[PDB]
Structures are given as structure tokens and as C-alpha cells.
Design a protein around this motif. Structure first.
Motif, PDB file in Angstrom:
ATOM      1  N   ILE B   9      -3.287   2.753  25.014  1.00 60.32           N
ATOM      2  CA  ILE B   9      -1.896   2.952  24.591  1.00 60.32           C
ATOM      3  C   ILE B   9      -1.052   2.563  25.783  1.00 60.32           C
ATOM      4  O   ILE B   9      -1.254   3.067  26.888  1.00 60.32           O
ATOM      5  N   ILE B  10      -0.163   1.609  25.574  1.00 61.31           N
ATOM      6  CA  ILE B  10       0.668   1.073  26.642  1.00 61.31           C
ATOM      7  C   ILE B  10       2.069   1.665  26.467  1.00 61.31           C
ATOM      8  O   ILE B  10       2.630   1.625  25.378  1.00 61.31           O
ATOM      9  N   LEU B  11       2.604   2.279  27.515  1.00 59.95           N
ATOM     10  CA  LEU B  11       3.917   2.948  27.403  1.00 59.95           C
ATOM     11  C   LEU B  11       5.049   2.054  27.872  1.00 59.95           C
ATOM     12  O   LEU B  11       4.839   1.180  28.713  1.00 59.95           O
ATOM     13  N   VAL B  41      -9.375  -3.355  31.579  1.00 58.76           N
ATOM     14  CA  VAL B  41      -8.661  -2.125  31.240  1.00 58.76           C
ATOM     15  C   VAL B  41      -7.182  -2.371  31.468  1.00 58.76           C
ATOM     16  O   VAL B  41      -6.814  -3.120  32.374  1.00 58.76           O
ATOM     17  N   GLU B  42      -6.349  -1.766  30.625  1.00 60.28           N
ATOM     18  CA  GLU B  42      -4.903  -1.876  30.715  1.00 60.28           C
ATOM     19  C   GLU B  42      -4.267  -0.597  30.202  1.00 60.28           C
ATOM     20  O   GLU B  42      -4.879   0.137  29.439  1.00 60.28           O
ATOM     21  N   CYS B  59      -4.258   8.437  32.642  1.00 62.37           N
ATOM     22  CA  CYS B  59      -4.287   8.091  34.060  1.00 62.37           C
ATOM     23  C   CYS B  59      -3.064   8.601  34.829  1.00 62.37           C
ATOM     24  O   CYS B  59      -1.931   8.184  34.561  1.00 62.37           O
ATOM     25  N   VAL B  60      -3.315   9.507  35.775  1.00 61.12           N
ATOM     26  CA  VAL B  60      -2.268  10.145  36.620  1.00 61.12           C
ATOM     27  C   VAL B  60      -2.754  10.058  38.080  1.00 61.12           C
ATOM     28  O   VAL B  60      -3.833  10.544  38.400  1.00 61.12           O
ATOM     29  N   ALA B 103      -6.107  -0.008  35.002  1.00 61.31           N
ATOM     30  CA  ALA B 103      -5.358   1.066  34.367  1.00 61.31           C
ATOM     31  C   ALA B 103      -4.044   1.296  35.094  1.00 61.31           C
ATOM     32  O   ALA B 103      -3.938   1.055  36.296  1.00 61.31           O
ATOM     33  N   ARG B 104      -3.021   1.725  34.367  1.00 59.23           N
ATOM     34  CA  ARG B 104      -1.723   1.948  34.992  1.00 59.23           C
ATOM     35  C   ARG B 104      -1.546   3.439  35.150  1.00 59.23           C
ATOM     36  O   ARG B 104      -1.546   4.189  34.163  1.00 59.23           O
ATOM     37  N   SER B 105      -1.407   3.869  36.399  1.00 57.82           N
ATOM     38  CA  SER B 105      -1.285   5.293  36.690  1.00 57.82           C
ATOM     39  C   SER B 105       0.135   5.781  36.478  1.00 57.82           C
ATOM     40  O   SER B 105       1.078   5.122  36.884  1.00 57.82           O
TER      41      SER B 105
END
Ligand SMILES: [Cl-]
Ligand SMILES: [Cl-]
Lengths: 17, 188
Positions: B9-11, B41-42, B59-60, B103-105
Motif C-alpha cells: 500500500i503506497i501512501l 519492495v515498495e 515500516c516505521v 520499503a519507505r519508512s
């Protein structure tokens, strides 16, 4: 009241009957 | 078998999201047995599955976090083989793996926004440390598969991960979550 956990079946789009 | 990323899920003004599938049922089963996942991964939120259940991971700060009742003690399938949990906090219902490279944190953070498995963004009102209420009640079926999903503040910073819904007659009224603070307490 009721405390519900929100797991679904396996896979991206889980299959139901 | 390993937990396997099967989608993301891309925000995103206001908070928006969309979903994208990355794996099918068979590749999910096989990748679970090998622990080897060579896909790119994205995004900030991963859709994840074992062979018996699926849920979300958020991802945090370079850690990919999810619920213990979803992931248990399992490895995450990765490009170099299975990834051992970096954090495993059973009492908080929290586990974390080192986030895979692409991944985007999100970064840590009272009108909040829950991002569901179907990439809907729904308003939540924080009602204490680890509980929020749904400003517009929805059936609990609408939240099926969203455990481990993020609760965001209006700037899109992370406030916690979604754990369980409080329900009355099939209608979800409140969400129970793991605060971003408990991730910090866990991390030391
Ligand atoms: Cl295994
Ligand atoms: Cl696949």
C-alpha cells in the motif's frame, strides 16, 4: 461488546465460500 | 514457514492510499517454504501472508512492524533468505524485522487516520493511549485483514499499528492499537 482480531485467509486476495 | 510480502500500500493534501498486488497464492506458498523473496519492495505498508493467514506490516524508522498474533515468531522472506525478527514483544503483540531495502519508512508523530487492507483511509479519534474510536462506524468485515496497519496523524506520520477492533453486533466502533511509543520502549 466483543474484541475482534482481524486476520484474513492466506494470499493477497483471500478466497471465501 | 516465513511471512511473505504479497502486496503493498503506497501512501500519499489529505491522506490517500492505493494498493498493488505483487504475488499470487502459489508463489506465496512456495516463497513461504524457501524464505527467499527476490521481488522488489515498495511503499510504506506491506500486505503479508503466511500459508494460513494474511494481514499488514508497517515500516516505521527502518523497522517493518506487525502484530504478533499474525506473524508469531516467524522469519520474513527476503532477498538473501529468511530475515530473523529484530524485535519480538509478545505482551505488546508486536514484532519487527529489519525493513527490506526498497520499503519507505514512516517517521513517528488527535484526529487520526487508519489505512485499511483495501487502502481506504478512515478517520479515527484517539481516546487514550492504545484506543481510538471510529468517527464513522463501519462493518467489521470492512477491516478484515488490516491487523498491523498504520494509524496516521494528519501529516502522515505514524502513531501506531492497528491490532484489533472493538465491535458491537458486527459493527466496528473502536480500534485497539500498538502505540509508536511501545515500539520505542521495545527498541531499548
Ligand atoms: Cl519454514
Ligand atoms: Cl508469485
Amino acid at each position: 461488546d466483543e474484541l475482534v482480531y482481524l486476520l484474513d485467509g492466506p494470499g493477497y486476495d483471500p478466497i471465501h465460500s | 514457514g516465513s511471512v511473505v510480502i504479497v502486496g503493498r500500500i503506497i501512501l500519499s493534501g489529505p491522506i490517500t492510499a492505493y494498493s498493488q498486488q505483487t504475488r499470487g497464492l502459489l508463489g506465496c506458498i512456495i516463497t513461504s517454504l524457501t524464505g527467499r523473496d527476490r521481488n522488489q519492495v515498495e511503499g510504506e505498508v506491506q500486505v503479508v501472508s503466511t500459508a494460513t493467514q494474511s494481514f499488514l506490516a508497517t515500516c516505521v524508522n527502518g523497522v517493518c512492524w506487525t502484530v504478533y498474533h499474525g506473524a508469531g515468531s516467524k522469519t520474513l522472506a527476503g532477498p538473501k533468505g529468511p530475515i530473523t525478527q529484530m524485535y519480538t514483544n509478545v505482551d505488546q503483540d508486536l514484532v519487527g524485522w529489519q525493513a527490506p531495502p526498497g520499503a519507505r519508512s514512516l517517521t513517528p508523530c488527535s484526529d487520526l487516520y487508519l489505512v485499511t487492507r483495501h487502502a481506504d483511509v478512515i478517520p479515527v479519534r484517539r481516546r487514550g493511549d492504545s484506543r481510538g474510536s471510529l468517527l464513522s462506524p463501519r462493518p467489521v468485515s470492512y477491516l478484515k485483514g488490516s491487523s498491523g496497519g498504520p494509524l496516521l496523524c494528519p501529516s502522515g506520520h505514524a502513531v501506531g499499528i492497528f491490532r484489533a477492533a472493538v465491535c458491537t453486533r458486527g459493527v466496528a466502533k473502536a480500534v485497539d492499537f500498538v502505540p509508536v511509543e511501545s515500539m520505542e520502549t521495545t527498541m531499548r
